Design a binder for this molecule. Structure first.
Ligand code: B12
Ligand code: B12
Ligand code: B12
Ligand SMILES: Nc1ncnc2c1ncn2[C@@H]1O[C@H](COP(=O)(O)OP(=O)(O)OP(=O)(O)O)[C@@H](O)[C@H]1O
Ligand SMILES: Nc1ncnc2c1ncn2[C@@H]1O[C@H](COP(=O)(O)OP(=O)(O)OP(=O)(O)O)[C@@H](O)[C@H]1O
Ligand SMILES: Nc1ncnc2c1ncn2[C@@H]1O[C@H](COP(=O)(O)OP(=O)(O)OP(=O)(O)O)[C@@H](O)[C@H]1O
Ligand SMILES: [K+]
Ligand SMILES: [K+]
Ligand SMILES: [K+]
Ligand SMILES: [Mg+2]
Ligand SMILES: [Mg+2]
Ligand SMILES: [Mg+2]
Ligand SMILES: [Mg+2]
Ligand SMILES: [Mg+2]
Ligand SMILES: [Mg+2]
Lengths: 186, 186, 186
């Protein structure tokens, strides 16, 4: 039975079982990561024949976001519970994709309108939810020690979603629109 | 004319007409409930022939979320304005659905990736927005008396969305994926 | 290379290059506007033959939201960097659309369930994200001078999304549902 009712007065438990209010910065941080993970699942459900090449990596991101959320739910001071997420191989893996997707699509110097195909648009939504989760992770960092590797990966991840969004448009022959007042920023 | 312009400097009114800033915790709480309600409307628009059995209950949730938001917009101390939402029958109704949907789908012991079909994925998005609204309701509770029945229902509602999401996948013969590092948690 | 890694410890730059934490109210404000802009791109991707008349204006909103975000990223005190967004013509343009869409659809006196077609439902999601961004803009205003024209436009914009959502339902012969406990509020 998934409903325990223990949360009905607004408190809940983190890893190690201590109790926090649900609006605690820590709970908010891994809560936003869960929201992002759910949005990535929604984004993956929009994949079509033209965009199947993106499916595996989005599922892999979902697995990695669970690892990130686990670590955000882990208090530094309880030595019974270790951080598990190590940024190097995940983050390199993102960077390789950012480099290959940047190479393939038409180069721009301006910001672009976040949109195009339904999948590209969903990848821009993922980009911005990732950045919202990142803000909450930084909130938490300013009050508690965190696994800083999670922050590295989450920062890189929104660049991945930008590059993937442009690639998704490319895969369906949809051009990106430029912001009509962009200075040359890239 | 829906635009009054009275909010153009960032203030607005709650039930009873007092004026608050738009970033007041109370406004944020029922604002997040409105966002959830809109997402539930979007989720319902994704229903297909295979998933029609979910339509009625999602519309009912929308009506209940208006009742919740009304109460969150109601200050305790103004006796002219009563709380209207009573948790027992709504919450029991959710629990019956959680029990029947839990029964029908394949049992898991691990966390699952939030995704699958477009509708199941949208139900996971609903789950996480509900939880975001819940955090904001708890913020407000820690500063002002609230209708605690709203919090009970909102807590239960995210368990409903989890169970419904798994059921939606079942209705389209889509299995759930396990988190590859989940301990047995359920 | 879009990834600089300068943000990997949670700090970033605004217009004029000063450094802020990513959870700074200013960063959150224009971050929520970026999220809204991405959602408007997603909403536009749902346009069908029946709803093509809405495409141009949603793209125009995306361009205007970049102008708003630019100004939110601009500190008042650095005289090298000017506000660019002027509310009058954008806001009048929204109001004309609100008036024409209000005229055409069936009049209601009660709140409606936010939903209907997939596009109308997405326009209600846009409405509520706009309002979430507005709360964060008001947060920032209460700590720093801002371009108040941005707030005018963002307030009006959520009324636009409400009116457009009802119009989208009308364009596909979908009626709006009333909240079953609404007093006559409009
Ligand atoms: C303002 C701005 C934006 C704003 C634009 C929103 C708004 N205000 O309208 C927002 C937050 C949306 C934005 C987003 C992004 N931006 Co930008 N942005 C800037 C910024 C701060 C100023 C650019 C400028 O106008 N020139 C200065 C006058 C700079 C940093 C800076 N202070 O120069 C970056 C910067 C231009 N952006 C950058 C990037 C990478 C992005 C994103 C890809 C980040 C992301 N992963 O989401 C997106 C792209 C958005 C798009 N749709 O094209 C990088 C570009 C680096 C490069 N080598 O290409 C810069 C230089 C920041 C940095 N140093 O990391 N950005
Ligand atoms: C961490 C965790 C999560 C995190 C996982 C995110 C992350 N950190 O990666 C998040 C917030 C996503 C999560 C979500 C949920 N979780 Co969880 N979760 C936990 C937690 C705190 C630790 C589990 C663990 O690893 N073992 C301990 C080492 C426990 C509570 C606890 N302290 O034990 C619950 C707990 C395992 N989760 C629980 C539940 C119900 C859920 C959700 C269904 C809640 C919801 N309605 O959204 C979802 C399921 C998510 C999924 N996709 O399967 C329940 C299970 C109870 C039961 N009888 O089945 C527990 C026991 C919490 C509780 N007591 O209410 N959870
Ligand atoms: C509560 C309320 C809501 C709540 C309802 C949520 C909840 N609590 O359930 C929320 C935030 C969702 C809401 C949203 C909107 N509302 Co309303 N709402 C009110 C409010 C505060 C009380 C209405 C009431 O019950 N009568 C009083 C007992 C009034 C303001 C007030 N204090 O009277 C407005 C008010 C009724 N709402 C108004 C409007 C315009 C809206 C929105 C269109 C705003 C928007 N752009 O999103 C939406 C419509 C939502 C819908 N789906 O129909 C206006 C109507 C003005 C008019 N001439 O038509 C009012 C009068 C506020 C104002 N003065 O600007 N609202
Ligand atoms: N609103 C929320 N936002 C983010 N994380 C939450 C929220 N509520 C609970 N959590 C976290 O997610 C885990 C799973 O949530 P769950 O809803 O099962 O917990 P609960 O609300 O404390 O209990 P219950 O829902 O059974 O009364 C909790 O153990 C806690 O770590
Ligand atoms: N940004 C917002 N987030 C959440 N709730 C809001 C927000 N702005 C207003 N509210 C609430 O929702 C109701 C309807 O919003 P509405 O936009 O009509 O109000 P307003 O902004 O004060 O007025 P106007 O938009 O006509 O200038 C308000 O009466 C207030 O209770
Ligand atoms: N999480 C965020 N939320 C909102 N705005 C952000 C966030 N991170 C950065 N910004 C803003 O958006 C701009 C573009 O973001 P970008 O991710 O390129 O910056 P960064 O994180 O500081 O650098 P990098 O990602 O290259 O390490 C930044 O210059 C800053 O103004
Ligand atoms: K639960
Ligand atoms: K209004
Ligand atoms: K970057
Ligand atoms: Mg530890
Ligand atoms: Mg970054
Ligand atoms: Mg009262
Ligand atoms: Mg709960
Ligand atoms: Mg200036
Ligand atoms: Mg308003």
């Amino acid at each position: 039975k998934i409903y325990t009712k223990n949360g009905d007065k607004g408190q809940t438990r983190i890893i190690g079982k201590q109790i926090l209010y649900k609006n605690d910065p820590r709970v908010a941080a891994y809560g936003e990561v869960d929201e992002l993970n759910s949005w990535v699942g929604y984004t993956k459900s929009l994949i079509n024949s033209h965009t199947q090449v993106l499916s595996n990596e989005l599922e892999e991101i979902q697995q990695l976001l669970f690892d990130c959320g686990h670590d955000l739910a882990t208090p530094a001071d309880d030595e019974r519970h270790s951080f598990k997420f190590k940024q190097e191989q995940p983050t390199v893996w993102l960077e390789e994709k950012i480099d290959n997707y940047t190479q393939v699509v038409p180069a721009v110097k301006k910001h672009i309108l976040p949109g195009g195909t339904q999948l590209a648009s969903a990848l821009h939504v993922a980009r911005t939810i990732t950045r919202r989760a990142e803000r909450q992770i930084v909130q938490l960092m300013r009050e508690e020690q965190i696994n800083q590797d999670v922050l590295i990966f989450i920062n890189r991840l929104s660049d991945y979603f930008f590059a993937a969004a442009r690639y998704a448009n490319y895969l369906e022959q949809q051009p990106d629109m430029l912001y009509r007042n962009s200075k040359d920023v890239f």
